[PDB]
């Protein structure tokens, strides 16, 4: 913030030390830039974090880059506050570094707002205690596995099942049913996927190409090309992206984390490169502080609600271990994609009955759509046990009753279809939006004997159930014809 | 010969016109293990060459407050204890030029083959950054790897990262010099880094290369496990460089790590030698940096900066099958896709023994050309009905008549799955083979008849209908030409086979 | 059998390829060191007066 | 392969010739130094050397 | 840093607060012989010796070598914190500590004969040009383990050099390795 300057003391890796005047230097988690000199003939200049005070008139701290090329002596300037990120509706459409510079070439962003990262959280008394629900307006997610608003989801599905159409539907669905935007996190993005990504989301409509800022999203890439202090980091940086559109603006934004175990994985390398020693199995001593000092600004104000949808991975395929269960310690719902549904075609590929939700109770959802929800999945549970009777037997040496539940589970997996607006593009079909009066009202209707003279095929890939009666209708007349 | 002397010595004493320059300057503290602590060069960068009194060059790694303690390219013998280290403000550096196809070098990427010497007029760093966002595109240009199961199954494109994974002695080696075998007729410069192996072994995977006439479009950077530390920890990154310079001359390369695990084991005893903190099995915390700041540098660059690409094939040996060990996890988490191998499957007697079930490829059909997808669709459908009926196989005999056909069609599509070593089936051969198998022209021969009418089927149809070649590779779809060409050729073999 | 039969024909020509091409080559390398040694000592004059002014 | 090993060869040794013929003439070299006077040949070089320390202070 | 480098460094500042930077070097100039030879550097190391019988001695050596008393106060904490094993590590750290804080870069010129002191005094000129020290404390060796001249070590300890007796025949050598 002034002549504050300090000068390298020690380079170890990407971790440095930094000597300073015996009566300034800065505070912990405060950034400061190493102006220092590129071997090729120009000057670069590299941002650390302070992590620890060491002693005589010197610091530890921790580069966002790399720190080749660096000798001792490179003269280090203090900034008197922590990384600060430009914030704001500037920050719509465009690709961000850990250090809120843009990477997508596009050119420069005015800095016109300029939040830290390193922020405590809403106050006891500034939190909302409500228990409301977020509507994405798909069918299965809202009847199945409710969200929260000010809560936080868990994505499991491997790789090629429709995650990244399930988040740019989410994005347009929360930019079209409600005023809210969206912020994309990437923890630990491969290159190639977050060109793809940003090329999918250019061309989906999201991101408003021919005229930026009408933009849906905001990216920040924290990728594995960068030192641990950036992929550590890059997840505070999104959510401080986030928080502004919140604070300020007061809208409902919708915060997209990539793996957030890469989050726990760039902590533990930044506390195995300072030297502390490892918690339990290896991670980090400052394990769930370090969780939930991001996870604590991902609530609902009495302004808006950020709403966090983190895909999480499972060391070993087991929910035991520490990074797995302290992320279960704050996960308010959880949505599991198939790829059994994804190769039967039934997009979006959410498993019906291995998506949970703490959301879904009598005293937060109604009786009634509590008791539908029950209902659809025992359905789907006795069509799941009665497959292989099925198999052997066939529809008909079985019972009445289990010949109507098999039949109407049929036309319940079908009708957790839905044609998505971003999806559109290559399947063609227009995209619909579905509240969760429609689908508790088509459910209950597919459920009691009002729709059961139907075709299965009728039900598949449409929304709000009057679709459903009409494309049976249509495809009467298929035959009629 | 008489007077060359004179005029080369002539030459080198005017060609250098007397100059003076600052330098930076250390003399030893302690000398030991491959590490030197040097007191003085307080001006040296992180990771700039430093020379040493007796010849011998070193990397200065850690700048602590009192000493610069220095990696050795070499053994640090005739070190002194108080001899001068003198920095050069050169960073690690390789001479590259086209001039290295059809030789090997070792990690300083000088000839290890006594052929002479590369005639090099450029020059790229060892360790340059990676191709960002902007000067990238989306992979979709099909990298052949000859292996039928994997060009099916786990297709690998041009500008991917994928993983040879597996445990000790399943084929990972052998899966890689299928690929670069395969890759004659495609314009692929290849590279193929031997970590820390054997000599004796990169002798016979070079002599096999000379002898398959493979050696034309390859370069072998080979470091044995007797070098220091610092150069099998430098090897793949001057294959990387090497490979970058072709790349961004607009040319398709493909480039081989083998066993990255020994990078990072080599890269561990530098770093427990330096008295740095360790991790998990005891590696330090930036082996992920390591593995990923090699592995993002693999990219299909962005059409304006020239189309070319550079496909990265790292191997990873697991020990027991732990793929929750810590280098392999890492290296999963940074790769695109993997292929993992099985010595169940490989004792089994189905060679490559790729685990088709739990091996993944993200970027997935877009690496295929559209003749191969066709059949490629049909081949997964019937290829997982066997992995479920899989139990069944011990009482087939008390099933249904299509539980039957699904298992005896699953036990002779893993038949088609095998190939031998160094036999890489170019794309017509394979859409052939999987188009004869999964439509169900060999669901009435023995299991030991498959394998044999394939290879006679395959010879006769290269031999006598060149019109299906011809069109899967001009036109790059399964036409329906090359279907009822194809159908002809399989009733004349089936004719000329059954008269064995 | 007969194409190792080259096999080894090929050891049997490069055996002479080599070896008459070497002495050739070190006997000459020898003729020119021991040449040069009456002269070596005028060259070395001019390394003199290009170090020292 | 095996005439580029043989070229090999020729072109150590050239460089071999090259090495052992400039280690007699650093031997030759030292001695040629050895007797020149002393005081007025540092009187001479050192001041060369003087300029020459003067024009590295400007570069 | 080190002990002997927050030693040194301490003592410097407490002769820079009272300006007896000229009696200090005097002083510290003694006290690098009176702890050199052995047996007085072992006196007063020995941890079994009480530090009752070291500080009665301690006075008597500060007494008749006429010392500062700030520096015997020095010696006395030396005495007190045990660190007086260090002794000969902080005493030869002080210089590079007072020439920092003096301003001097000490840069010795390592040349075969004496030199006649107008190019020293130029050579004295050139490295307090090149540095911006003030006024540069020019060392030099009669060490005739060079060939033909001169050559300058300057900087913190040693670490910039420019070598001008015998690195145009390495240059030779280098040209004439040719690899
Ligand atoms: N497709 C194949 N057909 C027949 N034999 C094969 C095949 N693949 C590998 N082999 C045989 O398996 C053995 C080991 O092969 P390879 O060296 O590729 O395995 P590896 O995993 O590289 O071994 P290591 O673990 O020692 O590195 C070799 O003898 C090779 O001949
Ligand atoms: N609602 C949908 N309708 C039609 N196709 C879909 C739908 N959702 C996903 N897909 C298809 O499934 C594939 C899923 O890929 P994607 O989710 O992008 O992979 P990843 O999860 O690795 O990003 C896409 O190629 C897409 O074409």
């Given at each position: 913030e002034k002549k504050n300057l300090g000068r390298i003391a020690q380079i170890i890796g990407p971790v440095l030390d930094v000597a300073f005047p015996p009566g300034k230097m800065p505070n912990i988690y405060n950034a400061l830039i190493v102006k220092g000199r590129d071997t090729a003939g120009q000057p670069m200049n590299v941002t650390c974090e302070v992590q620890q005070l060491l002693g005589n008139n010197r610091v530890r701290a921790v580069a966002m880059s790399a720190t080749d090329g660096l000798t001792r002596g490179m003269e280090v300037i203090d900034t008197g506050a922590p990384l600060s990120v430009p914030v704001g509706g500037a920050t719509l459409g465009r690709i961000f570094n850990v250090l809120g510079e843009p990477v997508d070439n596009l050119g420069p962003v005015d800095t016109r707002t300029t939040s830290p990262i390193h922020r405590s959280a809403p106050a006891f008394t500034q939190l909302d205690t409500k228990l409301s629900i977020f509507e994405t307006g798909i069918k299965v997610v809202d009847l199945l596995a409710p969200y929260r608003r000010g809560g936080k989801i868990g994505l499991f599905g491997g790789a090629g099942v429709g995650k990244t159409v399930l988040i740019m539907e989410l994005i347009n669905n929360i930019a079209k049913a409600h005023g809210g935007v969206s912020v994309f996190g990437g923890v630990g993005e491969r290159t190639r996927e977050g060109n793809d990504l940003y090329m999918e989301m250019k061309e989906s409509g999201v991101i408003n190409e021919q005229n930026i800022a009408e933009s849906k999203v905001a990216l920040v890439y924290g990728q594995m090309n960068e030192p641990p202090g950036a992929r550590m980091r890059v997840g505070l940086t999104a959510l401080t992206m986030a928080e502004y559109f919140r604070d300020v603006n007061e809208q409902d934004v919708l915060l997209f984390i990539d793996n957030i175990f890469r989050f726990v994985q760039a902590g533990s390398e930044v506390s195995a490169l300072l030297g502390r020693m490892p918690s339990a199995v290896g991670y980090q001593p400052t394990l769930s502080t370090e969780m939930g000092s991001l996870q604590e600004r991902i609530t609902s104000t009495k302004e808006g609600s950020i709403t966090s949808i983190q895909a999480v991975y499972v060391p070993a395929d087991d929910l035991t271990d520490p990074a797995p269960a302290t992320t279960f310690a704050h996960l308010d719902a959880t949505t599991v994609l198939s790829r059994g549904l994804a190769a039967k075609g039934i997009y979006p590929a959410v498993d019906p009955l291995d998506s949970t939700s703490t959301m879904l109770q009598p005293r937060i959802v109604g009786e009634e759509h509590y008791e539908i929800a029950q209902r659809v999945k025992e359905t789907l549970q006795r069509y799941k046990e009665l497959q292989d009777i099925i198999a052997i037997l066939g529809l008909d040496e079985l019972s009445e009753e289990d010949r109507l539940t098999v039949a109407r589970a049929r036309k319940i997996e079908r009708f957790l279809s839905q044609p998505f607006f971003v999806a559109?593009?290559?399947?063609?079909s227009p995209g619909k939006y579905v509240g969760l009066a429609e689908t508790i009202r088509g459910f209950q209707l597919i459920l009691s004997g009002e729709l059961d003279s139907l075709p299965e095929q009728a039900f598949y890939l449409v929304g709000n159930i009057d679709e459903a009666t009409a494309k049976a209708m249509n495809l009467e007349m298929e035959s009629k014809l | 010969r008489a007077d060359e002397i004179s005029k080369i010595i002539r030459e080198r004493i005017e060609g250098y016109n007397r100059e003076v320059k600052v330098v930076n300057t250390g003399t030893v503290l302690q000398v030991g293990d491959g590490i030197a602590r040097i007191h003085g060069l307080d001006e040296v960068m992180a990771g700039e060459l430093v020379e040493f009194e007796e010849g011998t060059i070193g990397i200065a790694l850690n700048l602590e407050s009192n000493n610069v303690g220095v990696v050795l390219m070499g053994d640090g013998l005739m070190i002194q204890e108080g001899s001068s280290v003198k920095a050069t403000g050169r960073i690690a550096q390789i001479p590259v030029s086209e001039a290295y196809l059809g030789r090997v070098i070792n990690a300083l990427a000088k000839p290890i083959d006594g052929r002479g010497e590369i005639t090099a007029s450029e020059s790229r760093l060892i360790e340059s950054p990676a191709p960002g966002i902007m000067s990238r595109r989306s992979v979709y240009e099909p990298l052949q790897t000859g292996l039928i199961a994997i060009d099916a199954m786990i297709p690998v494109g041009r500008g991917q990262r994928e993983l040879i994974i597996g445990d000790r002695q399943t084929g990972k080696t052998a899966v890689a010099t299928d690929t670069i075998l395969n890759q004659q007729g495609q314009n692929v410069i290849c590279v193929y880094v031997a970590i820390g192996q054997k000599a004796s072994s990169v002798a016979q995977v070079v002599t096999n290369f000379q002898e398959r006439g493979a050696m034309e479009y390859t370069i072998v950077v080979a470091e044995t496990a007797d070098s220091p530390a610092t150069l099998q920890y430098l090897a793949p990154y001057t294959g990387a460089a090497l490979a970058e310079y072709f790349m961004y001359r607009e040319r398709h390369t493909l480039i081989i790590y083998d066993d990255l695990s020994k990078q990072a084991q080599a890269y561990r005893q530098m770093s427990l030698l330096l008295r740095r903190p360790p991790g998990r099995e005891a590696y330090p915390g930036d082996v992920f940096y390591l593995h990923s700041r090699l592995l993002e540098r693999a990219a299909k660059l962005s059409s304006l900066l020239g189309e070319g690409s550079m496909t990265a094939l790292p191997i990873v040996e697991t020990q027991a099958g732990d793929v929750s060990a810590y280098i392999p996890t890492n290296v999963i988490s940074i790769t695109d896709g993997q292929i993992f191998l099985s010595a169940d499957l490989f004792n089994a007697g189905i060679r490559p023994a790729i685990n088709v079930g739990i091996s993944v490829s993200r970027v997935g059909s877009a690496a295929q050309i559209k003749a191969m997808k066709k059949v490629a669709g049909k081949l997964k459908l019937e290829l997982a009905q066997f992995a479920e009926l899989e139990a069944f196989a011990q009482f087939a005999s008390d099933l249904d008549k299509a539980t039957q056909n699904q298992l005896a069609r699953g036990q002779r599509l893993r038949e088609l799955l095998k190939q031998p070593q160094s036999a890489p089936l170019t794309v017509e051969e394979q859409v052939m083979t999987i188009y004869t198998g999964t439509n169900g022209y060999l669901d009435s021969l023995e299991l030991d008849q498959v394998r044999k009418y394939l290879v006679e089927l395959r010879t006769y149809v290269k031999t006598n209908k060149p019109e299906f070649q011809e069109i899967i590779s001009s036109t790059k779809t399964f036409t329906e030409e090359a279907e009822a060409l194809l159908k002809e050729a399989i009733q004349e073999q089936m004719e000329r086979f059954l008269l064995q | 059998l007969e194409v190792e039969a080259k096999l080894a024909e090929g050891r049997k020509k490069i055996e002479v390829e080599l070896q008459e091409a070497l002495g050739s080559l070190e006997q000459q390398k020898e003729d020119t060191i021991k040449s040069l040694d009456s002269q070596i000592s005028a060259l070395s004059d001019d390394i003199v007066k290009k170090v020292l002014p | 392969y095996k005439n580029e090993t043989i070229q090999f060869e020729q072109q150590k040794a050239i460089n071999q010739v090259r090495q052992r013929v400039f280690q007699q003439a650093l031997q030759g070299a030292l001695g040629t130094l050895n007797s020149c006077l002393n005081n007025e040949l540092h009187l001479r070089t050192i001041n060369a050397n003087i300029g020459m320390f003067g024009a590295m202070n400007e570069i | 840093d080190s002990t002997a480098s927050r030693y040194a460094s301490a003592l410097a500042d407490v002769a820079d607060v009272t300006g007896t930077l000229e009696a200090t070097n005097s002083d510290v100039e003694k006290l690098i012989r009176i702890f050199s030879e052995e047996p007085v550097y072992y006196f007063f190391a020995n941890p079994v010796i009480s530090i009752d019988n070291k500080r009665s001695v301690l006075d008597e050596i500060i007494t008749t070598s006429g010392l500062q008393p700030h520096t015997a106060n020095f010696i006395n904490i030396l005495i007190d914190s045990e660190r007086i094993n260090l002794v000969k590590e902080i005493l030869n750290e002080f210089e590079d500590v007072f020439n920092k804080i003096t301003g001097t870069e000490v840069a010795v010129v390592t040349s075969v004969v004496k030199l006649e002191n107008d190019h020293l005094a130029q050579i004295a000129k050139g490295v307090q040009k090149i540095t911006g020290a003030k006024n540069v404390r020019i060392k030099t060796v009669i060490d005739p383990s060079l060939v033909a001249g001169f050559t300058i070590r300057y900087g913190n300890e040693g670490s910039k050099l420019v070598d001008m007796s015998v690195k145009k025949q390495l240059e030779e050598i280098a040209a004439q390795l040719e690899m």
């Amino acid at each position: 913030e002034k002549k504050n300057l300090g000068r390298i003391a020690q380079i170890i890796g990407p971790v440095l030390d930094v000597a300073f005047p015996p009566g300034k230097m800065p505070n912990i988690y405060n950034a400061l830039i190493v102006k220092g000199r590129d071997t090729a003939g120009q000057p670069m200049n590299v941002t650390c974090e302070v992590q620890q005070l060491l002693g005589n008139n010197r610091v530890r701290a921790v580069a966002m880059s790399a720190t080749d090329g660096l000798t001792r002596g490179m003269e280090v300037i203090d900034t008197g506050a922590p990384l600060s990120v430009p914030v704001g509706g500037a920050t719509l459409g465009r690709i961000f570094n850990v250090l809120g510079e843009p990477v997508d070439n596009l050119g420069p962003v005015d800095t016109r707002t300029t939040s830290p990262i390193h922020r405590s959280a809403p106050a006891f008394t500034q939190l909302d205690t409500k228990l409301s629900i977020f509507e994405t307006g798909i069918k299965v997610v809202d009847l199945l596995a409710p969200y929260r608003r000010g809560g936080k989801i868990g994505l499991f599905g491997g790789a090629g099942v429709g995650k990244t159409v399930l988040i740019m539907e989410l994005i347009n669905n929360i930019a079209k049913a409600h005023g809210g935007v969206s912020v994309f996190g990437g923890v630990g993005e491969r290159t190639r996927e977050g060109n793809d990504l940003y090329m999918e989301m250019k061309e989906s409509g999201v991101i408003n190409e021919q005229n930026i800022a009408e933009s849906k999203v905001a990216l920040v890439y924290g990728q594995m090309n960068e030192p641990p202090g950036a992929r550590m980091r890059v997840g505070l940086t999104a959510l401080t992206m986030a928080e502004y559109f919140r604070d300020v603006n007061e809208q409902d934004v919708l915060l997209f984390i990539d793996n957030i175990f890469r989050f726990v994985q760039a902590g533990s390398e930044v506390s195995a490169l300072l030297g502390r020693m490892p918690s339990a199995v290896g991670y980090q001593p400052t394990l769930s502080t370090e969780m939930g000092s991001l996870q604590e600004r991902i609530t609902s104000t009495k302004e808006g609600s950020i709403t966090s949808i983190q895909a999480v991975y499972v060391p070993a395929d087991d929910l035991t271990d520490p990074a797995p269960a302290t992320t279960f310690a704050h996960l308010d719902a959880t949505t599991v994609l198939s790829r059994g549904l994804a190769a039967k075609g039934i997009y979006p590929a959410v498993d019906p009955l291995d998506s949970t939700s703490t959301m879904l109770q009598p005293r937060i959802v109604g009786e009634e759509h509590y008791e539908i929800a029950q209902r659809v999945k025992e359905t789907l549970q006795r069509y799941k046990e009665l497959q292989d009777i099925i198999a052997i037997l066939g529809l008909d040496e079985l019972s009445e009753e289990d010949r109507l539940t098999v039949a109407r589970a049929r036309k319940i997996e079908r009708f957790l279809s839905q044609p998505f607006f971003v999806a559109e593009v290559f399947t063609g079909s227009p995209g619909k939006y579905v509240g969760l009066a429609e689908t508790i009202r088509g459910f209950q209707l597919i459920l009691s004997g009002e729709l059961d003279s139907l075709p299965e095929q009728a039900f598949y890939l449409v929304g709000n159930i009057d679709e459903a009666t009409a494309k049976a209708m249509n495809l009467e007349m298929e035959s009629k014809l | 010969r008489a007077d060359e002397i004179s005029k080369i010595i002539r030459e080198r004493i005017e060609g250098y016109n007397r100059e003076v320059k600052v330098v930076n300057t250390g003399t030893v503290l302690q000398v030991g293990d491959g590490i030197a602590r040097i007191h003085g060069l307080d001006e040296v960068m992180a990771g700039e060459l430093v020379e040493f009194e007796e010849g011998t060059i070193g990397i200065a790694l850690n700048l602590e407050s009192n000493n610069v303690g220095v990696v050795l390219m070499g053994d640090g013998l005739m070190i002194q204890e108080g001899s001068s280290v003198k920095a050069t403000g050169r960073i690690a550096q390789i001479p590259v030029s086209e001039a290295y196809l059809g030789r090997v070098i070792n990690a300083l990427a000088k000839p290890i083959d006594g052929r002479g010497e590369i005639t090099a007029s450029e020059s790229r760093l060892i360790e340059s950054p990676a191709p960002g966002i902007m000067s990238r595109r989306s992979v979709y240009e099909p990298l052949q790897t000859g292996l039928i199961a994997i060009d099916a199954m786990i297709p690998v494109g041009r500008g991917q990262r994928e993983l040879i994974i597996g445990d000790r002695q399943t084929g990972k080696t052998a899966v890689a010099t299928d690929t670069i075998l395969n890759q004659q007729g495609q314009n692929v410069i290849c590279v193929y880094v031997a970590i820390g192996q054997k000599a004796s072994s990169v002798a016979q995977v070079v002599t096999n290369f000379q002898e398959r006439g493979a050696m034309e479009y390859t370069i072998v950077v080979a470091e044995t496990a007797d070098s220091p530390a610092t150069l099998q920890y430098l090897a793949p990154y001057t294959g990387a460089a090497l490979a970058e310079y072709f790349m961004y001359r607009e040319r398709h390369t493909l480039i081989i790590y083998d066993d990255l695990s020994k990078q990072a084991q080599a890269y561990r005893q530098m770093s427990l030698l330096l008295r740095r903190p360790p991790g998990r099995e005891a590696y330090p915390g930036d082996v992920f940096y390591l593995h990923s700041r090699l592995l993002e540098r693999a990219a299909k660059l962005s059409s304006l900066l020239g189309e070319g690409s550079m496909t990265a094939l790292p191997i990873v040996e697991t020990q027991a099958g732990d793929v929750s060990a810590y280098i392999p996890t890492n290296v999963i988490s940074i790769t695109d896709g993997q292929i993992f191998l099985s010595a169940d499957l490989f004792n089994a007697g189905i060679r490559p023994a790729i685990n088709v079930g739990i091996s993944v490829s993200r970027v997935g059909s877009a690496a295929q050309i559209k003749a191969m997808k066709k059949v490629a669709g049909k081949l997964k459908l019937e290829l997982a009905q066997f992995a479920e009926l899989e139990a069944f196989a011990q009482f087939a005999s008390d099933l249904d008549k299509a539980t039957q056909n699904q298992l005896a069609r699953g036990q002779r599509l893993r038949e088609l799955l095998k190939q031998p070593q160094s036999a890489p089936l170019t794309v017509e051969e394979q859409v052939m083979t999987i188009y004869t198998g999964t439509n169900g022209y060999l669901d009435s021969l023995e299991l030991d008849q498959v394998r044999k009418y394939l290879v006679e089927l395959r010879t006769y149809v290269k031999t006598n209908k060149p019109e299906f070649q011809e069109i899967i590779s001009s036109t790059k779809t399964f036409t329906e030409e090359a279907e009822a060409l194809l159908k002809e050729a399989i009733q004349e073999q089936m004719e000329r086979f059954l008269l064995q | 059998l007969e194409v190792e039969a080259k096999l080894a024909e090929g050891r049997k020509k490069i055996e002479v390829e080599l070896q008459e091409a070497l002495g050739s080559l070190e006997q000459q390398k020898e003729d020119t060191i021991k040449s040069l040694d009456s002269q070596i000592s005028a060259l070395s004059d001019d390394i003199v007066k290009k170090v020292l002014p | 392969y095996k005439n580029e090993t043989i070229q090999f060869e020729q072109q150590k040794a050239i460089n071999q010739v090259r090495q052992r013929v400039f280690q007699q003439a650093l031997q030759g070299a030292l001695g040629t130094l050895n007797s020149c006077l002393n005081n007025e040949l540092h009187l001479r070089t050192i001041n060369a050397n003087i300029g020459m320390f003067g024009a590295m202070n400007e570069i | 840093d080190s002990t002997a480098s927050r030693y040194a460094s301490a003592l410097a500042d407490v002769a820079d607060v009272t300006g007896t930077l000229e009696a200090t070097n005097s002083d510290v100039e003694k006290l690098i012989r009176i702890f050199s030879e052995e047996p007085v550097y072992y006196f007063f190391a020995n941890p079994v010796i009480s530090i009752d019988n070291k500080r009665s001695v301690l006075d008597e050596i500060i007494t008749t070598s006429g010392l500062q008393p700030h520096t015997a106060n020095f010696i006395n904490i030396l005495i007190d914190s045990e660190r007086i094993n260090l002794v000969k590590e902080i005493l030869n750290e002080f210089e590079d500590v007072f020439n920092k804080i003096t301003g001097t870069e000490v840069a010795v010129v390592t040349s075969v004969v004496k030199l006649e002191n107008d190019h020293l005094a130029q050579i004295a000129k050139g490295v307090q040009k090149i540095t911006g020290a003030k006024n540069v404390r020019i060392k030099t060796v009669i060490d005739p383990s060079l060939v033909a001249g001169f050559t300058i070590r300057y900087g913190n300890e040693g670490s910039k050099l420019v070598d001008m007796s015998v690195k145009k025949q390495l240059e030779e050598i280098a040209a004439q390795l040719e690899m």
